[PDB]
């Protein structure tokens, strides 16, 4: 089954798990303010790691479009680039 | 039954079915260049409509995180 994705406004990339779950974004919060997608404090939990939106967006998009993760070698080069 | 999402480098968002299908991005093409997400010609097909990456990003994110589409009033106010 496909990986879970979790959103939190915890910041800190510029991260403990207590920090992450204290600021988790609900559906209702996102549905009332989609502009949070540009919030630099937005953190994405996927693959047991923490990413900002600019690093997680391809992985999110690949899962929604092809229902398949980006290859592990692909994720490494996308991240070591940035 | 969540909405289908299709990618295409068809551009021209400033669209024919023919031009969209001709430049549909496969998994291998995206896996070889994730930078396509910032390509100005990237077109997203969802809800029988065409969006660039900027408008389509929250819709796809809410489908991935909450497995539920954004509210129609929200998508409409977000796309305004
Ligand atoms: Ca919250
Ligand atoms: Ca193609």
Numbering used by the authors:
A (entry chain B): 462 to 475, 480 to 547
B (entry chain A): 462 to 475, 480 to 545
Reproduce passages from the article:
Lipins are magnesium-dependent phosphatidic acid phosphatases (PAPs) that catalyze the dephosphorylation of the membrane lipid phosphatidic acid (PA) to produce diacylglycerol (DAG). Our principal findings are that the M-Lip domain is a new protein fold that forms a dimer, binds membranes, and can affect lipin PAP activity, oligomerization, subcellular localization, and adipogenesis. Phospholipid synthesis and fat storage as triglycerides are regulated by lipin phosphatidic acid phosphatases (PAPs), whose enzymatic PAP function requires association with cellular membranes.
We also determined the structure of the mouse lipin 2 M-Lipxtal domain to 2.5 Å resolution. The M-Lip domain of mouse lipin 1 and lipin 2 formed a symmetric or near symmetric dimer in all three crystal forms with a root mean square deviation for all atoms ranging between 0.36–0.77 Å. The observation of near identical dimers in three different crystal structures strongly suggested the native quaternary structure of the M-Lip domain as dimeric. Notably, the residues involved in dimerization were highly conserved among human and mouse lipin 1, lipin 2, and lipin 3 paralogs. Lastly, our data suggest that the conserved dimer interface of the M-Lip may contribute to both homo and hetero-dimerization of mammalian lipins.
